[PDB]
Amino acid sequence: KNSKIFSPFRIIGNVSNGVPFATGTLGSTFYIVTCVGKTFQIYDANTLHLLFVSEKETPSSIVALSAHFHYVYAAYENKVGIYKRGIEEHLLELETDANVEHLCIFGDYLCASTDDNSIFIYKKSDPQDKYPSEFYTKLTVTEIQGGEIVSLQHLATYLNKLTVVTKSNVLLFNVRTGKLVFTSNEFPDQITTAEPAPVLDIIALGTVTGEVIMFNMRKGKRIRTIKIPQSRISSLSFRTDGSSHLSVGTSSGDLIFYDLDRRSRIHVLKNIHRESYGGVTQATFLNGQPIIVTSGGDNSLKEYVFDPSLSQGSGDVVVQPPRYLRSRGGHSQPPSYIAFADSQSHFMLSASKDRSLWSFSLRKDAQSQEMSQRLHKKQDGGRVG
Amino acid sequence: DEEDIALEFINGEKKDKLVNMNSFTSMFDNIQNVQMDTFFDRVMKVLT
Amino acid sequence: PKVVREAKKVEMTEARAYNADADTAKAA
Amino acid sequence: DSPVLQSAYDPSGQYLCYVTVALDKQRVGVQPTQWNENFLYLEDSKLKVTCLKWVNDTVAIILGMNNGEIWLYSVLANEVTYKFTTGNSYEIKDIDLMGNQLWCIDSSDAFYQFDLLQFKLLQHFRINNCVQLNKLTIVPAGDSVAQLLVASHSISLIDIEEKKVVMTFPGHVSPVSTLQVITNEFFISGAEGDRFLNVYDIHSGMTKCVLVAESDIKELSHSGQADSIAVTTEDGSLEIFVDPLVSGNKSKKSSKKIQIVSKDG
Amino acid sequence: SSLSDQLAQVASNNATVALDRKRRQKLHSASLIYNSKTAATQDYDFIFENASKALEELSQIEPKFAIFSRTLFSESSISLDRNVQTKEEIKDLDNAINAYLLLASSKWYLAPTLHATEWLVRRFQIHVKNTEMLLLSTLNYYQTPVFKRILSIIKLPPLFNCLSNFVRSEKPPTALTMIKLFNDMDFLKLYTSYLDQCIKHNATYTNQLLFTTCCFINVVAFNSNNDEKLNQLVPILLEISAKLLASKSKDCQIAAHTILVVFATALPLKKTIILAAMETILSNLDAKEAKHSALLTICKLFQTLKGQGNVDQLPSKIFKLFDSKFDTVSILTFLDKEDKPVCDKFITSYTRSIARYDRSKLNIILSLLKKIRLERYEVRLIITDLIYLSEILEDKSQLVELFEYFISINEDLVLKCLKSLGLTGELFEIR
Amino acid sequence: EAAWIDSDDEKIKVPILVTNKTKKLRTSYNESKINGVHYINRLRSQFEKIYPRPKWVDDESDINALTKILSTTYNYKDTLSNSKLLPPKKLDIVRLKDANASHPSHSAIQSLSFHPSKPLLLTGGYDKTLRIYHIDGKTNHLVTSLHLVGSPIQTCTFYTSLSNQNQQNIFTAGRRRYMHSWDLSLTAKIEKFSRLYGHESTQRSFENFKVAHLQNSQTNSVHGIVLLQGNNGWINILHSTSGLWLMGCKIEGVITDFCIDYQPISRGKFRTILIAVNAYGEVWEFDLNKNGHVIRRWKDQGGVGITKIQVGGGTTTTCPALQISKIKQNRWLAVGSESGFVNLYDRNNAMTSSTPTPVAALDQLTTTISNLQFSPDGQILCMASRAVKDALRLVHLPSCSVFSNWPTSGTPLGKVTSVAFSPSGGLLAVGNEQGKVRLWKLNHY
RNA sequence: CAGCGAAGGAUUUGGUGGAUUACUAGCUAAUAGCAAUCUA
């Protein structure tokens, strides 16, 4: 209900929820747009401060968001909201009742897809204005053409093409004439992730068994396959600072860094995010940067940096393992008990059902930090029980 | 009889000789001008 | 003395990225 | 603390089936209520009894273990007769049956249909917008195989054919630990940790009464026409409410209290 | 950071270029041969001509150095300056230097390679710029005054940091310090890269391989009681084990067998990886010494296998491959060896495989069962497989002969296997 | 080369100099509108110079299997699945609830035992109150607690008959000249054995006894035996049901301890042997299913005063059998000294020696040992003193290596005085003098 | 000496990362272009 005394303000102490985030560049900066339930949030990536929030909530929960340069495309129950600086600038109502599932942005054509393999693509009225505002057409993938959808994206250097990734097949489109062009081969198991590569026209796509196929869509083939035992894969990425490094993220909370020039595991990371809250929901390299931004479903966002090598002569063969860098988290379960620390209403304390205690700061949301459970040693001779 | 055949299974194992951190320091005294087959026999006799 | 496994101040270098704006066209 | 892991009465209250642990292995014992020594042991420590229910009519327990099996276990022949598998190796959280048809609920939130006359898996469905789920109860309206009542932490109601949430209820701050239908319109809910049972209407969803114990509830029995509700507190006392649905107009207190003290203090 | 370290970086960057007379003589006075006040008056042509003489005598004792005469020890090389030319030709320069360094890694016992490499040091400045390949090429000779000299003149790389109290000390660095050098995988991935280059150039030899293998088993020894470190350290030692078997030399093959046997007794591996290791060490087996050592290491690999499924069938394509590389009479005389190594689990799997995938020549299994003693679950599984074999194919004199031998010793075993499967009356019916 | 042809891009034309970012990929200052496939090739080269083209795409298009399996898996240890045995030098203990915590004790814990099949622990101390607990991993309570005045008990144990398994007699004894038997029947009926028939001049105490089955060997009246110690060299074997002196055996030199080793003879026949030591440490090994006469005698390699001998591996007092066919020949013997040196002997070759060498002669705990017991399956040896705190070690065998990870200094063992195992559960129980008995379990079992 | 006491305990010290002011994104020639380029 509406009130007359208290107005709601903000849900503080909340970082991620498990929706795959997106990233965007501005000059030589990087911002991370993460979802928190209904509103989203825009961090930066250098100091990982908060920068923006949506000025008002969404009707349903946000299911999928992406980001071009200034603009953030949120997607919930039936619509896609084009946002600027955390302020909504244009709704886009889809021509259905079907719930939207995924989207991509490229060139002029925005492209969103519902939960029945129906793809509304939209077009900018003027090839000069800032965001796609005008409905162009509606493609529809049928069950003859492939399975039910799981991602879509326009990989690079393709003249107004698109790549829909189903559960059984990869299938391109020419979005100007609305035409399919190239259905791929058959794939014998369910695939769940597909991210493009910074090399020419190939896309890495990982299955429910732990294999990564590398489809070359211009050739229509596969180039290589990375096999991994019984890992429910969740999120791929590539590193683009020259030294080629693939990075898979397994929903068992694993992050595996593969070299590709010599097909070797560089370093595994175990239990980076918690298993039960989804594992590694989304992990990506910032392009032209040797850092990693991971986000789990357990209300945590992390950055892992790759150090320079210690072998000044060998170089790319000896790779230092990833350090841990800045991270922002809350507790991952609903908070049990809540206090206010100071009279100035600056710090507040939470203690949650996951047995952690945090000092949130409701003034500036990079000051919130976990209190630490390291016992002061008994200076009378006793041993800690 | 399943725990009996399991107990016979664990009975059928002889004394191995484990490795420990100061078992192979002696090889560095005769790493010089020694044929590698004789080295392999030396490491197997210090192993078992 | 052990090998100095040592971190440093990290810095975000310049990005250099293809953008998708040049990937569409129009019939003339 | 109780060395009984869990226990349940047969309908009409003559036998008790209780799971205890005995040298890191659970064993199930049955006992009448006016000696029996057929302890069904379990195999290993990684296999413990999560939930159990009598059936009614070759007399049998069914025992949902913590791996994805329902051991339909006869009491006369001292062994598990049938082993209802699931597809996942996930630990189940509750079972409830009506006639032939039986429902199981997973840790991965799925709902499983079984039939103890034909030993198949009928259907298999997870649903959106209910995630932490730990116990259900089929709502009886004669042959209402539809409209079962699922509960953890906010109680939901589910038709089995339209397969959506039809009505949500104010749950508790804790996970629900007892969920017992008492009439054709009312059901007891009670969480763990809390002293506060509450009767909910299943049509309008308004709380009629809140039953206040004097300690934490552990289990409860009720009469057939809900004219008497006996709960057992956590500290081992017993609180029996007489006539809980007749009006202390909103929060009914404990009517009679029974403890069993020895003569040794 | 701060200014002092911020330009100590550029000092280390431009340490190779001499900027005046004092730094020029402090840079030129580094030498593998002469001391400081002698070396500060040499010119380039002097050390070049005696190095070229050292090179041509080294090239007639090894015919693969005239290429370095043509492209690195030529007359224009005394005018070729290193830090005056672009990154691509300096890349050509130092990979040619690395080729020379791994090629001349063997010759360091004899002074022609010292005088051959000292001009390379004095001119192309490998004692400051190309230091890594130099150190881990001459690391075998660590009790020698050539290594003490080269470590006294080197500028020490960030990996070899444990040696920095052995610069200009008369004590050679000890074996414990060599292990503590080898004891991190940042060094080990480097050293495996270097050994990969040595394999694909075939510059491997009996002293480098001996030293490498001895330090690797000492690393595994230090990481005996660290399960996480040992599991971290698997996929590099096993990696170069498999890359070491891909070569042709008997010495690197038996070095692969050595690291494999010590690693298998270090920690219990899985059945699939130990079977892949068995077929891998078999799939490139040529010389007789490699045959002998590989048989010993296969027996010990299978002896250090626990859990159920330990004495099961090795499959068909590894079984016929084992029989192709090793005939039956070699197995028989190896079992006839008087030292009697413990090979009971491998021989058990071998008996079950010869009874299931050949089922034709049972004189072999009877003979070697006579030749060794064997434990009870092993012989129980053998006679169970024999029961299944005797019922699928018709009984023979060899089969009933070994059966009555297992009557003659330990009757109640085959009685209890008949109690599991049938009855001794039914077995005498099938007699 | 392309598996598909778009057939639409070649008829397009784009003025590339409309904006800033698309005007650098011209090639002349007079060309304005370019063809589609030319445009694709131009921006394709622009992509290939904005990210370079590495070698791993043009590598290929998918003696090797070691590399292949090594690049496949991560966990390079099989022990997740079965393991069937112990891992050496690092065991998987966990802690449980303190088994004295429900109803505590006051004196030391001089005896501690398990029921052979039922989940029952027995505790007995000098405060002459033998308690019995039902034990489990969460909260373990006191079933009964017999108290008997004027008899501070020293050692006490369970016993079941091998034949009909429905006897469940406790036997208890202290420093006095009487011991007590008990048929447990969930008000108790206990009998007081004190009738010494043959020898009455050799017991100043009953404080050391064992209980052991035997066969009749002309019939099969398998029945019990109490084995009491004496004072000079005397150990007397009684009956357990009746109380008759069966016979006695004297060794030369002072008895320090003794143990019982059974061995099968046929399917349904078995033979019991008693092993006894001096302080000097030459043992007598004599069967007692016929009359008690020495069939083997040899000598421990060392020891000035040896303190405690315990056999194990197969079945024994602490791990008893239930069916007569379920009885098993032992494997390991162990002898422990006042100096702390425990030798452990194999007994698959050392029935032939007449002077056997030890498999290992370990010494890790310094002071004198008091209790040592094997596992019910013969993989853990458990050694413990009664002199200093944290004076217990666990030895993995057949590798004969002490476990390193446990016990640390921070374990709350206390000054240990007794220890016992589970028959099956791998549930270990330690007792000290200050009263409490603590409980651990071994996760491999 | 004691007790405390779940597969160690107790200290010295470097580096990095987050705070120490109250969280509206980068650059430039700034009612716009850039982020692959401001050049013709």
Cβ-proximal residues to C18 (8 Å cutoff; 6+ apart), any chain: A156, A157, F46, F47, F50, F51
Angle between helices E175-182 and E185-201 (to 10 degrees): 90
> What is the CA angle E53-E57-E63, rounded to 5?
125
Q: What is d(CA F407, CA F415) in angstroms, rounded to the nearest whole number?
A: 13
In the 3-class helix/strand/coil scheme, how is chain F assigned residue by residue?
CCCCCCCCHHHCEEEHHHCCCCCCCCCCCCCCEEEHHHHHHHHHHHHHHHCCCCCCCCCCCCCCHHHHHHHHCCCCCHHHCCCCCCCCCCCCEEECCCCCCCCCCCCCCCEEEECCCCCEEEEECCCCEEEEEECCCCCCEEEEEEECCCCCEEEEECCCCCCCCCCCEEEEEECCCCEEEEECCCCCEEEEECCCCCCCCCCCCCCCEEECCECCCCCCCCECCEEEECCCCEEEEECCCCCCEEEEEECCCCCCCEEEEEEEEECCEEEEEEEECCCCCEEEEEECCCCCCCCEEEECCCCCCEEEEEEECCCCCCCCCCCHHHCCCCCEEEEEECCCCEEEEECCCCCCCCCCCCCEEECCCCCCEEEEEECCCCCEEEEEECCCCCCEEEEECCCCEECCCCCCCCCCCCCEEEEECCCCCCEEEEEECCCCEEEEEECCC
In this structure, are strands D238-242 and D228-233 parallel, antiparallel, or unpaired? antiparallel
CB-nearest partner of B27 from E214, E251, E308: E214
Residues of C in contact with E161 (CB under 8 A): 1-4
Nearest CA in chain F to C24: F14
Asked if the C-beta of A160 comes within 8 angstroms of chain C's C-beta atoms, the answer is yes
- Distance (Å) from the C-alpha of residue B39 to the closest C-alpha of chain E? 8
Residues of C in contact with F9 (CB under 8 A): 25
Experiment used for this model: cryo-EM
Contact present, E100 and E107 (Cβ < 8 Å): no
Could you give phi then psi for residue A213, rounded to 5 degrees?
-90, 145
Report the nearest residue to nucleotide G1, CA vs C1'.
Answer: F388
- Distance (Å) from the C-alpha of residue F49 to the closest C-alpha of chain C? 10
In this structure, are strands F282-287 and F296-299 parallel, antiparallel, or unpaired? antiparallel
F97-122 CB burial, b ≥16 within 10 A, e <16:
bebbebeebebbbbbbbbbbebbbbb
Q: What is d(CA D216, CA E211) in angstroms, rounded to the nearest whole number?
A: 71
Task: Count how many Cα atoms sit within 13 Å of the Cα of residue E211 in the half-sphere of its side chain.
Answer: 20
Torsional sign, CA E84, E89, E95, E100: negative
- Distance (Å) from the C-alpha of residue D250 to the closest C-alpha of chain F? 39
Q: What is d(CA D63, CA D70) in angstroms, rounded to the nearest whole number?
A: 6
Q: How many helices (H) and strands (E) does chain B have?
A: 2, 0
Instruction: Quote the tokens at residue D127.
Output: 């649903």
Instruction: Quote the tokens at residue A3.
Output: 């009130």
Cβ-proximal residues to F174 (8 Å cutoff; 6+ apart), any chain: F126, F128, F151, F152, F153, F154, F206, F207
Q: What is d(CA A59, CA A96) in angstroms, rounded to the nearest whole number?
A: 17
D264 DSSP 8-state letter: T
Residues of C in contact with A291 (CB under 8 A): 10, 12
Q: Please give the radius of gyration of chain F, using alpha carbons only, rounded to the nearest integer.
A: 35
Task: Report the residue count for chain B.
Answer: 48
State the nucleotide closest to F408 in CA–C1' terms: G8
- Count CB neighbours of A156 within 10 A: 23
Cβ-proximal residues to E59 (8 Å cutoff; 6+ apart), any chain: E65, E66, E69
Q: What is d(CA A157, CA A154) in angstroms, rounded to the nearest whole number?
A: 9
What's the Cα-to-Cα distance from D141 to each of A191, D37, D162, D180, F435, rounded to whole Å?
44, 38, 18, 15, 60
Q: What is d(CA E254, CA E252) in angstroms, rounded to the nearest whole number?
A: 5
Distance from residue A205's CA to nucleotide G17's C1', rounded to whole Å: 33
Task: Count how many Cα atoms sit within 13 Å of the Cα of residue C5 in the half-sphere of its side chain.
Answer: 10
Which of A312, A319, A320 should we substitute to test contact with E (largest number of E Cβ atoms within 10 Å)? A312
B10 DSSP 8-state letter: H
Report the nearest residue to nucleotide G10, CA vs C1'.
Answer: A377
End-to-end CA distance of chain B: 34
- Count CB neighbours of F255 within 10 A: 20
Distance of CA F80 to the CA centre of its chain: 20
Nearest CA in chain E to C1: E162
Contact present, E196 and E240 (Cβ < 8 Å): yes
Q: What is d(CA E396, CA A8) in angstroms, rounded to the nearest whole number?
A: 91
Contact present, A74 and A89 (Cβ < 8 Å): no
Instruction: Quote the tokens at residue F294.
Output: 């020495």
């209802």: which residue's tokens?
D84
How many CB contacts within 8 angstroms connect chain C with chain F?
A: 25
Q: Residue A45 forms beta bridges with which residues?
A: none
Q: What is d(CA D47, CA C5) in angstroms, rounded to the nearest whole number?
A: 46
Question: Are B10 and F400 an interchain contact pair (Cβ–Cβ within 8 Å)?
Answer: no
Angle between helices E288-303 and E344-357 (to 10 degrees): 100
């057409």: which residue's tokens?
A137
Contact present, D160 and D138 (Cβ < 8 Å): no
Q: What is the resolution of this structure in A?
A: 4.9
Structural element, H or E, at residue B6: helix B2-11
Structural element, H or E, at residue B45: helix B36-47
End-to-end CA distance of chain F: 62
Could you give phi then psi for residue A317, rounded to 5 degrees?
-75, -45
Whose CA is closest to A43, among A302, A356, A243, A269?
A: A302
> What is the CA angle F96-F423-F161, rounded to 5?
140
A217-248 CB burial, b ≥16 within 10 A, e <16:
bbebebbbebebeebebbbbbbbbbebbbbbb
Which amino acid, one-letter code, is at E210?
Answer: L
Instruction: Quote the tokens at residue E21.
Output: 């007379």
Distance from residue A367's CA to nucleotide G20's C1', rounded to whole Å: 10
Structural element, H or E, at residue D252: strand D251-252
Long-range contacts of E223-232 (CB under 8 A, 24+ apart): E223/E183, E223/E266, E224/B18, E224/B19, E224/B20, E224/B21, E224/E266, E225/B20, E225/B21, E225/F89, E225/F90, E225/F404, E227/E267, E227/F77, E227/F90, E230/E266, E230/E267, E231/E267, E231/F75, E231/F76, E231/F77, E232/E185
What's the Cα-to-Cα distance from D168 to each of D96, D198, E252, rounded to whole Å?
20, 15, 72
Q: Is the CB of C4 under 7 A from strand G?
A: no
Contact present, F367 and F386 (Cβ < 8 Å): no
What's the Cα-to-Cα distance from E85 to each of A6, E13, E73, E80, rounded to whole Å?
73, 15, 18, 9
Q: What is d(CA A186, CA F119) in angstroms, rounded to the nearest whole number?
A: 59
In the 3-class helix/strand/coil scheme, how is chain A assigned residue by residue?
CCCCCCCCCCCCCCCCCCCCCEEEEECCEEEEEEEECCEEEEEECCCCCEEEECCCCCCCCCCEEEECCCEEEEECCCEEEEEECCEEEEEEECCCCCCEEEEEECCCCEEEEECCCEEEEEECCCCCCCCCCEEEEEEECCCCCCCCEEEEECCCCCCCEEEEEECCCEEEEECCCCEEEEECCCCCCCEEEEEECCCCCEEEEEECCCEEEEEECCCCEEEEEEECCCCCEEEEEEECCCCCEEEEEECCCEEEEEECCCCCEEEEEECCCCCCCCCEEEEEECCCCCEEEEEECCCEEEEEEECCCCCCCCCCCCCCCECCCCEEECCCCCEEEEEECCCCCCEEEEEECCCCEEEEECCCCCCCEECCCCCCCCCCCCCCC
Q: Is the CB of F405 under 7 A from strand G?
A: yes
Instruction: Quote the tokens at residue D255.
Output: 């009517």
Which amino acid, one-letter code, is at A63?
Answer: V
Whose CA is closest to A69, among E366, D189, C19, B5?
A: C19
Q: What is d(CA A22, CA A37) in angstroms, rounded to the nearest whole number?
A: 15
Torsional sign, CA E131, E134, E135, E137: positive
- B36 SS3 class: helix
Question: Are F84 and E308 an interchain contact pair (Cβ–Cβ within 8 Å)?
Answer: yes
B41 DSSP 8-state letter: H
Q: What is d(CA A376, CA A380) in angstroms, rounded to the nearest whole number?
A: 12
Which amino acid, one-letter code, is at A57?
Answer: E
Asked if the C-beta of E184 comes within 8 angstroms of chain C's C-beta atoms, the answer is yes
Contact present, F193 and F222 (Cβ < 8 Å): no
In this structure, are strands D156-158 and D176-181 parallel, antiparallel, or unpaired? unpaired
Q: What is d(CA F365, CA F308) in angstroms, rounded to the nearest whole number?
A: 14
- B40 SS3 class: helix
Q: What is d(CA F369, CA F342) in angstroms, rounded to the nearest whole number?
A: 8
Report the nearest residue to nucleotide G33, CA vs C1'.
Answer: F20
Contact present, E136 and E174 (Cβ < 8 Å): no
- Count CB neighbours of E192 within 10 A: 20
- Distance (Å) from the C-alpha of residue B33 to the closest C-alpha of chain F? 31
Whose CA is closest to E135, among E123, E118, E148?
A: E148
- Count CB neighbours of E391 within 10 A: 14
Whose CA is closest to E99, among E203, E233, E208, E218?
A: E203
